[PDB]
């Protein structure tokens, strides 16, 4: 229906798979950066491999006008132009900056269909870097990590673990994301005090709790035992939605029924109304890293990781497949606003009161498109 609805369902489908392997842990990731990397793989995939991807991410509006790179990139009504437009709209400033840089590291003179590199540069603005995998995979890895590290101001290091790439690696797709946004209604340093954050219904922990009073849109879901708070960013184009369950442990129930429908339903007009209220929100600092291979495989995307994978749209020369896929993300939420840095990567080898003192879910979205940029679960500030 739109990149917005698509980013939403994909976000939730990913969550339903992650929460199972990270129970009682914080969870934080960037849906947008993940669909972006997945889009660049999809560009050069055909047959079932290709069809299987779209059936799980649901970001390419059918019908399709051909797997031709010229077609896809010269269609004007597809996933690539949809994803491209959204990135253009949210990319920078003054009170908020957002950037997503992509890069393709490929072997010395490898049969990478010329048009593939052309389009990726065109639509995803990705630069091509010539790297020596065959005889210097050791150096290639450190060059790549070094680039990701610098794009994230040193926050995301060694995105690629030892021998995650070798002499059989043909290409590495990787992106870096940086988001810095000022709250429209900031918090005062002075009003920030220590306070108990009730993890389990029987276990607390001291955390710097930010506080302020003011007008904010809220919605009471007394029938789901939860409330939703919207904290707009100063840009006026983005906001953070905070879903807080009423009971100290009602989170395990909320994570079961939540989805695009409900969220859209709970964030409606006749549901949320402006009110003057007290808001307590803890300063948060999250650092997470995930292996997407298992996640995507569980979600239904399997051929891209198999021997029977078709990425001929990237190279007719040798048979290829995705070796590994990773996603790292770091977020900080304080008085002035929020900061997020991240990276999605994939290797292609030769084949009246609102106090949040208990666990809550949150997500940052683009107001006009309902596109979800960040999603997270906060169990430990």
Is 320:351 a contact under the CB 8 Å cutoff? yes
d(CA 8, CA 374): 10
Chain gaps in the chain, named by the residue before each (C–N > 2.5 Å): 92, 351
Query: How many Cβ atoms from other residues are within 10 Å of residue 280's Cβ?
Result: 18
Treating both helix axes as pointing N-terminal to C-terminal, what angle do 3-18 and 292-299 enclose, rounded to 10 degrees? 110
Query: CB under 8 Å to 121, separation ≥6 — which residues?
Result: 127, 128
Instruction: Specify whether the CB–CB gap between 245 and 255 falls below 8 A.
Output: no
Alpha helices in 286-341 (DSSP H): 292-299
HSE, CB side, 13 Å, CA atoms: give it for residue 62.
Answer: 6
Letter string b/e over residues 109-123, b meaning 16 or more CB atoms within 10 A of that residue's CB:
ebebbebbbebbeeb
Q: Rounded to an integer, what distance in angstroms lies between the CA atom of residue 321 and that of residue 141?
A: 19
φ, ψ dihedrals at 69, nearest 5°: -55, -35
Provide the pairing of β-strand 169-182 with 96-107. Answer: antiparallel
Report d(CA 317, CA 269) in Å as an integer. 55
Residue 288 annotated as lining a ligand binding site: no
Other CB atoms within 10 Å distance of the CB of residue 253: 14
Token reading at 80:
């690539």
Peptide bond into 63 cis (omega under 30): yes
Give the strand pairing for 273-282 and 284-291: unpaired
Binding residues for Ca(2+), as ranges, are: 190
Binding residues: 190
């Amino acid at each position: 229906g739109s990149i917005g609805a698509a980013s939403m369902e994909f976000c939730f489908d990913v969550f339903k798979e992650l929460k199972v392997h990270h129970a009682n842990e914080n969870i934080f990731y960037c849906p947008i950066a993940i669909m972006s990397a997945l889009a660049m793989v999809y560009l050069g995939a055909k047959d079932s491999t290709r069809t299987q991807i779209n059936k799980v991410v649901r970001f390419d509006k059918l019908p399709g006008f051909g797997d031709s790179i010229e077609a896809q990139c010269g269609t004007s009504v597809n996933v690539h132009s949809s994803l491209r437009d959204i990135l253009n709209q949210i990319t920078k400033n003054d009170v908020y900056s957002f950037s997503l840089a992509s890069r393709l590291y490929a072997e010395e003179r490898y049969p990478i269909l010329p048009e593939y590199l052309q389009c990726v540069k065109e639509l995803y603005r990705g630069g091509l870097e010539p790297i020596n995998f065959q005889t210097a995979a050791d150096q290639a890895r450190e060059l790549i990590n070094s680039w990701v590290e610098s794009q994230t101001n040193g926050i995301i290091r060694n995105v690629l673990q030892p021998s995650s790439v070798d002499s059989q690696t043909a290409m590495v797709l990787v992106n870096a994301i940086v988001f810095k946004g000022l709250w429209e209604k900031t918090f005062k340093d002075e009003d920030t005090q220590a306070m108990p954050f009730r993890v389990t219904e029987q276990e607390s922990k001291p955390v710097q709790m930010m506080y302020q009073i003011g007008l904010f849109r809220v919605a009471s879901m007394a029938s789901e035992k939860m409330k939703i708070l919207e904290l707009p960013f100063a840009s006026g184009t983005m906001s953070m939605l905070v879903l807080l369950p009423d009971e100290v442990s009602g989170l395990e129930q909320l994570e079961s029924i939540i989805n695009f429908e409900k969220l859209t339903e709970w964030t409606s007009s006749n549901v949320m109304e402006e009110r003057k209220i007290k808001v307590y929100l803890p300063r948060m600092k999250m650092e997470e890293k995930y292996n997407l291979t298992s996640v995507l495989m569980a979600m239904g995307i399997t051929d891209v990781f198999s021997s029977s994978a078709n990425l001929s749209g990237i190279s007719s020369a040798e048979s290829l497949k995705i070796s590994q896929a990773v996603h790292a993300a770091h977020a900080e939420i304080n008085e002035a606003g929020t900061e997020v840095v991240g990276s999605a990567e994939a290797g292609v080898d030769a084949a009246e009161e609102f106090r949040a003192d208990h666990p809550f879910l949150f997500c940052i979205k683009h107001i006009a498109t309902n596109a979800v940029l960040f999603f997270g679960r906060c169990v430990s500030p």
